[PDB]
Protein backbone atom coordinates (compact mmCIF):
# COMPACT_ATOMS: atom_id res chain seq x y z
CA UNK A 1 0.00 0.00 0.00
CA UNK A 2 1.54 3.26 -1.20
CA UNK A 3 0.39 6.69 0.02
CA UNK A 4 0.51 9.73 -2.28
CA UNK A 5 1.38 13.11 -0.73
CA UNK A 6 -0.09 16.41 -1.96
CA UNK A 7 2.10 18.41 -4.40
CA UNK A 8 0.89 21.80 -3.12
CA UNK A 9 -0.95 23.32 -0.16
CA UNK A 10 -4.66 24.13 -0.18
CA UNK A 11 -8.00 22.35 0.10
CA UNK A 12 -8.99 18.97 -1.35
CA UNK A 13 -11.75 19.27 -3.94
CA UNK A 14 -13.45 16.44 -5.85
CA UNK A 15 -12.01 15.79 -9.32
CA UNK A 16 -15.45 15.65 -10.98
CA UNK A 17 -16.00 19.33 -10.16
CA UNK A 18 -13.08 20.34 -12.39
CA UNK A 19 -14.21 22.58 -15.31
CA UNK A 20 -12.76 20.31 -18.02
CA UNK A 21 -14.12 17.20 -19.74
CA UNK A 22 -10.63 15.67 -19.82
CA UNK A 23 -10.19 15.74 -16.04
CA UNK A 24 -13.79 15.71 -14.77
CA UNK A 25 -14.89 12.54 -16.56
CA UNK A 26 -11.65 10.90 -15.40
CA UNK A 27 -10.27 10.23 -18.88
CA UNK A 28 -6.66 11.16 -18.13
CA UNK A 29 -6.88 9.43 -14.75
CA UNK A 30 -8.50 9.26 -11.32
CA UNK A 31 -7.60 11.38 -8.30
CA UNK A 32 -8.35 14.76 -6.73
CA UNK A 33 -7.89 18.49 -7.27
CA UNK A 34 -6.51 21.05 -4.82
CA UNK A 35 -7.32 24.76 -4.57
CA UNK A 36 -3.85 26.40 -4.74
CA UNK A 37 -2.73 28.68 -1.91
CA UNK A 38 0.97 27.82 -1.88
CA UNK A 39 3.67 28.62 -4.43
CA UNK A 40 5.39 25.33 -5.28
CA UNK A 41 4.50 21.98 -6.86
CA UNK A 42 6.24 19.17 -4.97
CA UNK A 43 6.81 15.67 -6.35
CA UNK A 44 4.05 13.57 -4.73
CA UNK A 45 5.99 10.31 -4.37
CA UNK A 46 9.54 8.95 -4.47
CA UNK A 47 10.34 8.03 -8.06
CA UNK A 48 11.63 9.15 -11.44
CA UNK A 49 10.11 12.24 -13.08
CA UNK A 50 8.83 11.28 -16.53
CA UNK A 51 8.28 14.46 -18.52
CA UNK A 52 7.62 18.17 -18.00
CA UNK A 53 5.55 20.31 -20.38
CA UNK A 54 7.14 23.05 -22.48
CA UNK A 55 4.82 25.54 -20.78
CA UNK A 56 6.27 24.37 -17.45
CA UNK A 57 2.80 24.30 -15.88
CA UNK A 58 2.68 20.55 -15.27
CA UNK A 59 4.74 17.36 -15.12
CA UNK A 60 4.50 13.57 -14.96
CA UNK A 61 6.22 11.30 -12.44
CA UNK A 62 6.51 7.54 -11.99
CA UNK A 63 7.04 6.04 -8.54
CA UNK A 64 9.55 3.31 -7.70
CA UNK A 65 6.58 1.16 -6.69
CA UNK A 66 5.25 1.43 -10.23
CA UNK A 67 2.61 4.16 -10.19
CA UNK A 68 2.53 6.82 -12.92
CA UNK A 69 1.29 10.11 -11.48
CA UNK A 70 0.34 13.31 -13.28
CA UNK A 71 0.16 16.78 -11.74
CA UNK A 72 -1.38 19.54 -13.86
CA UNK A 73 -1.77 23.09 -12.57
CA UNK A 74 -4.99 24.78 -13.63
CA UNK A 75 -7.10 24.11 -16.71
CA UNK A 76 -6.13 25.31 -20.20
CA UNK A 77 -3.21 27.17 -18.62
CA UNK A 78 -1.13 26.35 -21.71
CA UNK A 79 -2.26 29.58 -23.40
CA UNK A 80 -0.15 31.54 -20.91
CA UNK A 81 2.95 30.18 -22.67
CA UNK A 82 4.87 29.86 -19.40
CA UNK A 83 4.06 33.34 -18.13
CA UNK A 84 4.12 33.12 -14.34
CA UNK A 85 5.70 29.68 -14.09
CA UNK A 86 9.35 28.80 -13.48
CA UNK A 87 11.09 25.47 -14.06
CA UNK A 88 13.23 24.03 -11.26
CA UNK A 89 13.38 20.26 -11.82
CA UNK A 90 14.62 18.43 -14.91
CA UNK A 91 13.15 15.69 -17.14
CA UNK A 92 14.50 12.37 -15.89
CA UNK A 93 15.74 13.68 -12.54
CA UNK A 94 15.26 11.42 -9.53
CA UNK A 95 13.36 13.01 -6.65
CA UNK A 96 11.78 12.26 -3.28
CA UNK A 97 8.70 13.54 -1.45
CA UNK A 98 9.22 17.15 -0.35
CA UNK A 99 11.34 18.01 -3.38
CA UNK A 100 10.43 21.18 -5.27
CA UNK A 101 9.56 20.53 -8.92
CA UNK A 102 7.81 23.68 -10.14
CA UNK A 103 7.37 27.08 -8.50
CA UNK A 104 4.52 29.40 -9.47
CA UNK A 105 3.20 32.91 -8.79
CA UNK A 106 -0.30 32.59 -7.33
CA UNK A 107 -1.66 36.17 -7.51
CA UNK A 108 -0.75 36.45 -11.20
CA UNK A 109 -2.24 33.07 -12.12
CA UNK A 110 -5.41 33.70 -10.11
CA UNK A 111 -6.35 36.54 -12.46
CA UNK A 112 -4.89 35.20 -15.73
CA UNK A 113 -5.23 31.44 -16.18
CA UNK A 114 -8.61 29.98 -17.13
CA UNK A 115 -8.65 28.04 -13.87
CA UNK A 116 -6.51 27.61 -10.76
CA UNK A 117 -7.74 24.16 -9.68
CA UNK A 118 -4.92 21.61 -9.87
CA UNK A 119 -5.90 17.99 -10.65
CA UNK A 120 -3.62 15.18 -9.47
CA UNK A 121 -4.37 11.84 -11.12
CA UNK A 122 -2.76 8.47 -11.86
CA UNK A 123 -2.29 7.33 -15.46
CA UNK A 124 -1.89 3.57 -15.01
CA UNK A 125 -5.12 2.72 -13.19
CA UNK A 126 -4.94 -0.91 -14.32
CA UNK A 127 -2.09 -1.67 -11.90
CA UNK A 128 -3.96 -0.16 -8.94
CA UNK A 129 -6.52 -2.52 -7.39
CA UNK A 130 -8.08 -0.07 -4.94
CA UNK A 131 -7.83 3.71 -4.61
CA UNK A 132 -9.02 5.97 -1.79
CA UNK A 133 -9.28 9.77 -1.67
CA UNK A 134 -8.75 11.84 1.48
CA UNK A 135 -10.40 15.11 2.53
CA UNK A 136 -9.71 18.31 4.45
CA UNK A 137 -7.10 21.05 4.03
CA UNK A 138 -3.53 20.10 3.09
CA UNK A 139 0.01 21.52 3.24
CA UNK A 140 3.05 21.45 0.95
CA UNK A 141 4.66 18.01 0.68
CA UNK A 142 3.46 16.71 4.04
CA UNK A 143 -0.26 15.96 4.30
CA UNK A 144 -1.30 12.84 2.34
CA UNK A 145 -4.20 12.95 -0.14
CA UNK A 146 -4.44 9.64 -2.00
CA UNK A 147 -3.75 6.12 -0.75
CA UNK A 148 -3.50 3.61 -3.59
CA UNK A 149 -3.06 -0.16 -3.43
CA UNK A 150 -0.94 -1.94 -6.03
Amino acid sequence: TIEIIAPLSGEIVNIEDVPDVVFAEKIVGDGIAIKPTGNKMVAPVDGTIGKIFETNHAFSIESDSGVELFVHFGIDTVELKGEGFKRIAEEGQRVKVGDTVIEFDLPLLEEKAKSTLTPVVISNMDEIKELIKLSGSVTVGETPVIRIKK
Binding site: E11, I12, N14, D17, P19, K35, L117, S135
Partner: protein, 370 residues
Protein backbone atom coordinates in the same frame (compact mmCIF):
# COMPACT_ATOMS: atom_id res chain seq x y z
CA UNK B 1 -42.45 -14.44 -8.76
CA UNK B 2 -41.29 -11.90 -6.18
CA UNK B 3 -37.50 -12.08 -6.36
CA UNK B 4 -35.40 -10.63 -3.53
CA UNK B 5 -31.68 -10.58 -2.68
CA UNK B 6 -30.11 -10.50 0.79
CA UNK B 7 -26.45 -9.50 1.13
CA UNK B 8 -25.43 -11.31 -2.06
CA UNK B 9 -21.67 -11.17 -2.65
CA UNK B 10 -19.58 -12.37 -5.59
CA UNK B 11 -15.82 -12.55 -6.11
CA UNK B 12 -13.34 -14.06 -8.56
CA UNK B 13 -10.74 -15.15 -6.02
CA UNK B 14 -9.54 -11.77 -4.76
CA UNK B 15 -11.46 -9.47 -7.10
CA UNK B 16 -14.73 -8.48 -5.42
CA UNK B 17 -17.07 -7.54 -8.27
CA UNK B 18 -20.21 -7.16 -6.16
CA UNK B 19 -20.36 -5.96 -2.55
CA UNK B 20 -23.24 -7.14 -0.34
CA UNK B 21 -26.35 -5.91 -2.16
CA UNK B 22 -29.99 -5.92 -1.10
CA UNK B 23 -32.94 -5.77 -3.50
CA UNK B 24 -36.67 -6.04 -2.80
CA UNK B 25 -38.58 -6.72 -6.02
CA UNK B 26 -42.33 -7.18 -5.73
CA UNK B 27 -44.69 -9.15 -7.98
CA UNK B 28 -45.31 -7.58 -11.38
CA UNK B 29 -42.67 -4.91 -10.83
CA UNK B 30 -40.54 -3.63 -13.70
CA UNK B 31 -36.97 -3.29 -12.41
CA UNK B 32 -34.07 -2.08 -14.57
CA UNK B 33 -30.37 -2.33 -13.75
CA UNK B 34 -28.23 0.56 -15.00
CA UNK B 35 -24.61 1.63 -14.80
CA UNK B 36 -21.33 2.18 -16.69
CA UNK B 37 -19.67 -0.53 -18.80
CA UNK B 38 -18.89 -3.32 -16.35
CA UNK B 39 -20.15 -2.55 -12.85
CA UNK B 40 -22.10 -5.58 -11.66
CA UNK B 41 -25.13 -5.04 -13.91
CA UNK B 42 -23.86 -7.70 -16.32
CA UNK B 43 -23.02 -10.31 -13.69
CA UNK B 44 -25.97 -9.62 -11.38
CA UNK B 45 -28.61 -10.73 -13.89
CA UNK B 46 -26.65 -13.90 -14.62
CA UNK B 47 -26.50 -14.74 -10.91
CA UNK B 48 -30.30 -14.58 -10.70
CA UNK B 49 -30.68 -16.91 -13.68
CA UNK B 50 -28.22 -19.43 -12.25
CA UNK B 51 -25.74 -19.15 -15.10
CA UNK B 52 -23.27 -17.73 -12.59
CA UNK B 53 -22.40 -19.09 -9.14
CA UNK B 54 -23.08 -17.20 -5.91
CA UNK B 55 -20.26 -16.70 -3.40
CA UNK B 56 -22.37 -15.62 -0.42
CA UNK B 57 -25.87 -14.45 0.49
CA UNK B 58 -29.28 -15.75 -0.58
CA UNK B 59 -31.57 -15.63 -3.61
CA UNK B 60 -35.34 -15.84 -3.13
CA UNK B 61 -37.37 -16.28 -6.32
CA UNK B 62 -40.93 -16.35 -4.99
CA UNK B 63 -39.96 -16.96 -1.35
CA UNK B 64 -37.64 -19.95 -1.78
CA UNK B 65 -33.85 -20.34 -1.66
CA UNK B 66 -32.56 -20.78 -5.22
CA UNK B 67 -28.79 -20.51 -4.72
CA UNK B 68 -28.13 -24.24 -5.15
CA UNK B 69 -31.08 -24.64 -7.53
CA UNK B 70 -30.10 -25.34 -11.17
CA UNK B 71 -31.10 -22.73 -13.83
CA UNK B 72 -33.67 -24.93 -15.59
CA UNK B 73 -35.79 -25.71 -12.52
CA UNK B 74 -35.87 -22.09 -11.33
CA UNK B 75 -38.78 -21.27 -13.62
CA UNK B 76 -37.27 -18.20 -15.25
CA UNK B 77 -36.60 -17.18 -18.86
CA UNK B 78 -33.93 -14.93 -20.33
CA UNK B 79 -32.99 -13.10 -23.53
CA UNK B 80 -29.29 -12.62 -24.22
CA UNK B 81 -27.47 -9.81 -26.01
CA UNK B 82 -26.49 -12.17 -28.82
CA UNK B 83 -30.08 -13.52 -28.76
CA UNK B 84 -28.72 -17.09 -28.62
CA UNK B 85 -30.65 -18.38 -31.64
CA UNK B 86 -29.97 -21.89 -32.95
CA UNK B 87 -28.76 -21.61 -36.58
CA UNK B 88 -29.66 -25.20 -37.51
CA UNK B 89 -33.27 -24.86 -36.39
CA UNK B 90 -36.25 -22.89 -37.66
CA UNK B 91 -37.81 -19.92 -35.88
CA UNK B 92 -40.71 -22.08 -34.69
CA UNK B 93 -38.24 -24.64 -33.35
CA UNK B 94 -36.11 -21.96 -31.67
CA UNK B 95 -39.12 -20.65 -29.73
CA UNK B 96 -40.38 -24.15 -28.95
CA UNK B 97 -36.99 -25.69 -28.12
CA UNK B 98 -37.91 -25.55 -24.44
CA UNK B 99 -41.11 -27.57 -24.80
CA UNK B 100 -39.78 -29.91 -27.50
CA UNK B 101 -37.44 -31.56 -25.00
CA UNK B 102 -38.33 -32.98 -21.57
CA UNK B 103 -42.03 -33.76 -21.97
CA UNK B 104 -43.22 -32.93 -25.47
CA UNK B 105 -46.73 -32.07 -26.67
CA UNK B 106 -47.01 -31.60 -30.44
CA UNK B 107 -50.55 -30.22 -30.16
CA UNK B 108 -49.60 -27.68 -27.48
CA UNK B 109 -46.33 -26.63 -29.15
CA UNK B 110 -48.01 -25.64 -32.42
CA UNK B 111 -50.64 -23.79 -30.38
CA UNK B 112 -48.17 -21.97 -28.11
CA UNK B 113 -45.92 -20.92 -31.00
CA UNK B 114 -48.73 -19.43 -33.10
CA UNK B 115 -50.17 -17.30 -30.28
CA UNK B 116 -46.79 -15.61 -29.85
CA UNK B 117 -45.85 -15.50 -33.54
CA UNK B 118 -49.14 -13.72 -34.31
CA UNK B 119 -48.58 -10.72 -32.03
CA UNK B 120 -44.88 -10.46 -32.92
CA UNK B 121 -45.65 -10.88 -36.64
CA UNK B 122 -43.42 -13.92 -37.10
CA UNK B 123 -46.02 -16.45 -38.24
CA UNK B 124 -45.04 -15.89 -41.87
CA UNK B 125 -41.44 -16.64 -40.92
CA UNK B 126 -41.91 -19.82 -38.88
CA UNK B 127 -40.06 -22.04 -41.36
CA UNK B 128 -37.03 -19.79 -41.76
CA UNK B 129 -33.38 -19.93 -40.73
CA UNK B 130 -32.19 -17.24 -38.24
CA UNK B 131 -29.52 -16.18 -40.75
CA UNK B 132 -32.24 -15.28 -43.26
CA UNK B 133 -33.76 -12.79 -40.83
CA UNK B 134 -32.78 -9.16 -40.25
CA UNK B 135 -31.22 -7.78 -37.07
CA UNK B 136 -34.56 -6.47 -35.86
CA UNK B 137 -36.41 -9.68 -36.67
CA UNK B 138 -33.91 -11.87 -34.81
CA UNK B 139 -34.59 -9.96 -31.59
CA UNK B 140 -38.31 -10.67 -31.92
CA UNK B 141 -37.45 -14.36 -32.15
CA UNK B 142 -35.47 -14.18 -28.91
CA UNK B 143 -38.28 -12.47 -27.01
CA UNK B 144 -40.73 -14.93 -28.56
CA UNK B 145 -38.74 -17.83 -27.12
CA UNK B 146 -39.34 -16.76 -23.52
CA UNK B 147 -43.00 -15.94 -24.14
CA UNK B 148 -43.57 -19.56 -25.17
CA UNK B 149 -42.08 -20.97 -21.97
CA UNK B 150 -44.18 -18.53 -19.90
CA UNK B 151 -41.77 -18.11 -16.97
CA UNK B 152 -42.29 -16.47 -13.57
CA UNK B 153 -39.67 -13.79 -14.18
CA UNK B 154 -38.33 -12.30 -17.42
CA UNK B 155 -34.62 -11.46 -17.69
CA UNK B 156 -33.68 -8.98 -20.42
CA UNK B 157 -29.92 -8.50 -20.84
CA UNK B 158 -29.73 -5.39 -23.04
CA UNK B 159 -31.83 -6.53 -26.04
CA UNK B 160 -32.04 -3.07 -27.62
CA UNK B 161 -28.31 -2.85 -28.37
CA UNK B 162 -28.21 -4.40 -31.85
CA UNK B 163 -30.87 -2.23 -33.49
CA UNK B 164 -30.45 1.07 -35.35
CA UNK B 165 -30.60 4.50 -33.70
CA UNK B 166 -34.15 5.61 -34.56
CA UNK B 167 -35.40 2.03 -34.43
CA UNK B 168 -34.06 1.56 -30.90
CA UNK B 169 -35.93 4.59 -29.57
CA UNK B 170 -39.25 3.55 -31.09
CA UNK B 171 -38.99 -0.08 -29.96
CA UNK B 172 -38.79 1.05 -26.33
CA UNK B 173 -42.56 1.51 -26.42
CA UNK B 174 -43.06 -2.15 -27.34
CA UNK B 175 -41.50 -3.17 -24.03
CA UNK B 176 -43.94 -0.94 -22.14
CA UNK B 177 -46.90 -2.46 -23.98
CA UNK B 178 -45.33 -5.90 -23.52
CA UNK B 179 -45.17 -5.37 -19.77
CA UNK B 180 -48.66 -4.19 -18.78
CA UNK B 181 -50.38 -6.56 -21.21
CA UNK B 182 -48.64 -9.61 -19.76
CA UNK B 183 -48.29 -8.23 -16.25
CA UNK B 184 -45.33 -10.03 -14.70
CA UNK B 185 -41.90 -9.45 -13.14
CA UNK B 186 -39.17 -8.33 -15.56
CA UNK B 187 -35.51 -7.58 -14.87
CA UNK B 188 -34.24 -5.34 -17.69
CA UNK B 189 -30.59 -4.32 -18.10
CA UNK B 190 -29.18 -1.37 -20.07
CA UNK B 191 -26.31 1.11 -20.29
CA UNK B 192 -28.39 4.06 -21.52
CA UNK B 193 -29.92 6.04 -18.64
CA UNK B 194 -32.89 7.20 -20.72
CA UNK B 195 -34.05 3.63 -21.37
CA UNK B 196 -34.58 3.02 -17.65
CA UNK B 197 -36.39 6.28 -16.93
CA UNK B 198 -38.98 5.67 -19.65
CA UNK B 199 -39.53 2.00 -18.80
CA UNK B 200 -38.79 1.12 -15.17
CA UNK B 201 -41.06 1.38 -12.16
CA UNK B 202 -38.04 0.89 -9.90
CA UNK B 203 -34.51 1.66 -11.11
CA UNK B 204 -31.39 0.17 -9.50
CA UNK B 205 -28.30 2.27 -10.22
CA UNK B 206 -25.08 0.29 -9.81
CA UNK B 207 -21.56 1.62 -9.33
CA UNK B 208 -18.61 -0.79 -9.29
CA UNK B 209 -20.94 -3.46 -7.93
CA UNK B 210 -22.09 -1.32 -5.02
CA UNK B 211 -25.74 -0.25 -5.07
CA UNK B 212 -25.72 3.53 -5.37
CA UNK B 213 -29.49 4.01 -5.09
CA UNK B 214 -32.79 2.17 -5.61
CA UNK B 215 -36.17 3.77 -6.33
CA UNK B 216 -38.63 5.22 -8.83
CA UNK B 217 -37.17 7.00 -11.90
CA UNK B 218 -38.43 10.42 -10.78
CA UNK B 219 -36.99 9.91 -7.30
CA UNK B 220 -33.49 9.43 -8.70
CA UNK B 221 -33.84 12.58 -10.79
CA UNK B 222 -34.94 14.83 -7.94
CA UNK B 223 -33.44 13.10 -4.89
CA UNK B 224 -30.10 11.38 -5.72
CA UNK B 225 -28.13 9.39 -3.14
CA UNK B 226 -24.66 10.58 -4.15
CA UNK B 227 -22.64 12.53 -6.72
CA UNK B 228 -22.64 9.43 -8.93
CA UNK B 229 -26.38 9.04 -9.51
CA UNK B 230 -26.89 12.80 -9.85
CA UNK B 231 -24.15 12.94 -12.47
CA UNK B 232 -25.28 9.74 -14.17
CA UNK B 233 -28.98 10.45 -14.74
CA UNK B 234 -30.26 13.20 -17.04
CA UNK B 235 -29.68 14.12 -20.68
CA UNK B 236 -27.08 16.80 -19.98
CA UNK B 237 -24.56 16.61 -17.14
CA UNK B 238 -25.53 18.30 -13.88
CA UNK B 239 -23.58 21.46 -13.08
CA UNK B 240 -21.16 20.86 -10.21
CA UNK B 241 -20.01 23.74 -7.99
CA UNK B 242 -17.22 23.30 -5.39
CA UNK B 243 -18.86 25.32 -2.60
CA UNK B 244 -17.84 25.61 1.05
CA UNK B 245 -20.00 25.53 4.18
CA UNK B 246 -20.12 28.76 6.19
CA UNK B 247 -23.01 28.24 8.60
CA UNK B 248 -25.85 25.84 9.38
CA UNK B 249 -29.36 26.28 10.78
CA UNK B 250 -32.51 24.49 11.95
CA UNK B 251 -33.19 22.99 8.51
CA UNK B 252 -30.99 24.70 5.91
CA UNK B 253 -27.31 24.93 4.97
CA UNK B 254 -25.57 28.13 3.92
CA UNK B 255 -22.71 27.68 1.45
CA UNK B 256 -20.04 29.90 -0.07
CA UNK B 257 -19.20 29.71 -3.77
CA UNK B 258 -15.52 29.09 -4.60
CA UNK B 259 -15.64 32.27 -6.66
CA UNK B 260 -13.49 35.33 -5.81
CA UNK B 261 -16.76 37.21 -5.18
CA UNK B 262 -17.57 34.58 -2.48
CA UNK B 263 -21.35 35.02 -2.52
CA UNK B 264 -23.51 33.38 0.15
CA UNK B 265 -26.71 31.41 -0.43
CA UNK B 266 -29.13 29.54 1.83
CA UNK B 267 -29.87 26.05 0.50
CA UNK B 268 -33.05 24.38 1.83
CA UNK B 269 -31.46 20.99 2.49
CA UNK B 270 -30.99 18.67 5.49
CA UNK B 271 -28.68 20.50 7.88
CA UNK B 272 -28.25 17.73 10.43
CA UNK B 273 -24.74 16.45 11.17
CA UNK B 274 -22.86 18.79 8.83
CA UNK B 275 -19.48 20.31 9.67
CA UNK B 276 -18.66 23.97 9.10
CA UNK B 277 -15.62 24.81 6.97
CA UNK B 278 -15.84 21.55 5.04
CA UNK B 279 -15.54 21.85 1.26
CA UNK B 280 -18.64 20.20 -0.16
CA UNK B 281 -20.13 20.11 -3.66
CA UNK B 282 -23.15 21.96 -5.07
CA UNK B 283 -25.17 20.40 -7.87
CA UNK B 284 -27.64 22.13 -10.17
CA UNK B 285 -29.28 20.84 -13.36
CA UNK B 286 -29.21 23.07 -16.47
CA UNK B 287 -32.97 22.59 -16.83
CA UNK B 288 -33.50 23.99 -13.34
CA UNK B 289 -31.46 27.16 -13.91
CA UNK B 290 -33.56 30.33 -13.97
CA UNK B 291 -32.90 33.55 -15.91
CA UNK B 292 -30.92 36.15 -13.93
CA UNK B 293 -33.87 38.53 -13.52
CA UNK B 294 -35.88 36.24 -11.23
CA UNK B 295 -33.42 34.77 -8.71
CA UNK B 296 -31.24 36.62 -6.20
CA UNK B 297 -27.98 34.74 -6.81
CA UNK B 298 -26.88 36.49 -10.00
CA UNK B 299 -24.20 35.05 -12.28
CA UNK B 300 -22.89 37.05 -15.23
CA UNK B 301 -21.03 35.40 -18.10
CA UNK B 302 -19.96 35.10 -21.73
CA UNK B 303 -21.45 32.63 -24.22
CA UNK B 304 -18.87 30.27 -25.73
CA UNK B 305 -20.89 27.75 -27.73
CA UNK B 306 -24.60 27.58 -28.55
CA UNK B 307 -26.40 24.33 -29.38
CA UNK B 308 -29.69 24.55 -31.26
CA UNK B 309 -31.68 21.33 -30.91
CA UNK B 310 -34.93 22.86 -32.17
CA UNK B 311 -37.26 21.74 -29.39
CA UNK B 312 -34.79 23.19 -26.89
CA UNK B 313 -31.67 25.37 -26.83
CA UNK B 314 -28.54 24.68 -24.78
CA UNK B 315 -26.04 27.44 -24.00
CA UNK B 316 -22.59 27.17 -22.44
CA UNK B 317 -21.75 30.12 -20.18
CA UNK B 318 -18.30 31.22 -19.02
CA UNK B 319 -18.46 32.95 -15.65
CA UNK B 320 -15.88 35.75 -15.05
CA UNK B 321 -15.78 35.04 -11.32
CA UNK B 322 -15.80 31.26 -10.94
CA UNK B 323 -13.27 29.56 -13.20
CA UNK B 324 -15.97 27.10 -14.27
CA UNK B 325 -18.04 26.57 -17.43
CA UNK B 326 -21.74 26.49 -16.53
CA UNK B 327 -24.32 24.86 -18.82
CA UNK B 328 -27.84 26.27 -19.22
CA UNK B 329 -30.85 24.69 -20.94
CA UNK B 330 -33.99 26.59 -21.96
CA UNK B 331 -36.97 25.27 -23.92
CA UNK B 332 -38.19 26.53 -27.31
CA UNK B 333 -35.55 28.64 -29.08
CA UNK B 334 -33.16 31.39 -27.94
CA UNK B 335 -31.05 33.32 -30.47
CA UNK B 336 -27.75 34.22 -28.78
CA UNK B 337 -24.48 34.97 -30.58
CA UNK B 338 -21.17 33.53 -29.38
CA UNK B 339 -19.43 36.17 -27.27
CA UNK B 340 -22.40 38.17 -26.02
CA UNK B 341 -22.79 38.64 -22.27
CA UNK B 342 -25.46 36.36 -20.80
CA UNK B 343 -26.46 36.14 -17.14
CA UNK B 344 -28.45 33.48 -15.27
CA UNK B 345 -29.97 33.00 -11.82
CA UNK B 346 -29.18 30.28 -9.30
CA UNK B 347 -32.36 29.04 -7.56
CA UNK B 348 -31.63 27.49 -4.13
CA UNK B 349 -34.85 25.45 -4.13
CA UNK B 350 -33.59 23.24 -6.96
CA UNK B 351 -30.13 22.59 -5.52
CA UNK B 352 -28.32 19.42 -4.48
CA UNK B 353 -25.52 19.18 -1.91
CA UNK B 354 -22.80 16.52 -1.83
CA UNK B 355 -20.18 15.86 0.86
CA UNK B 356 -16.53 14.97 0.23
CA UNK B 357 -17.11 11.21 0.32
CA UNK B 358 -19.94 11.65 -2.18
CA UNK B 359 -23.03 11.22 0.00
CA UNK B 360 -25.76 13.76 -0.73
CA UNK B 361 -27.67 15.83 1.82
CA UNK B 362 -31.38 15.04 1.52
CA UNK B 363 -33.35 17.80 -0.20
CA UNK B 364 -36.14 19.33 1.87
CA UNK B 365 -37.87 21.10 -1.01
CA UNK B 366 -41.06 19.16 -1.66
CA UNK B 367 -41.67 18.14 -5.27
CA UNK B 368 -44.99 16.76 -6.52
CA UNK B 369 -44.98 13.03 -7.25
CA UNK B 370 -42.57 11.94 -4.52
Amino acid sequence: ASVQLQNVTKAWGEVVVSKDINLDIHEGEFVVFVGPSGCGKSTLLRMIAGLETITSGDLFIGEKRMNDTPPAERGVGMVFQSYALYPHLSVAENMSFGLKLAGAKKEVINQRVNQVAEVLQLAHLLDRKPKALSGGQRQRVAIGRTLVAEPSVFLLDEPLSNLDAALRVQMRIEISRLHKRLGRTMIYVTHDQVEAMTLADKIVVLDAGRVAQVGKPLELYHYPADRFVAGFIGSPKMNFLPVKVTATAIDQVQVELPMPNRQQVWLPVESRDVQVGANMSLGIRPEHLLPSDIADVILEGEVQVVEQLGNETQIHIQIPSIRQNLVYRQNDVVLVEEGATFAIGLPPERCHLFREDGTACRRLHKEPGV
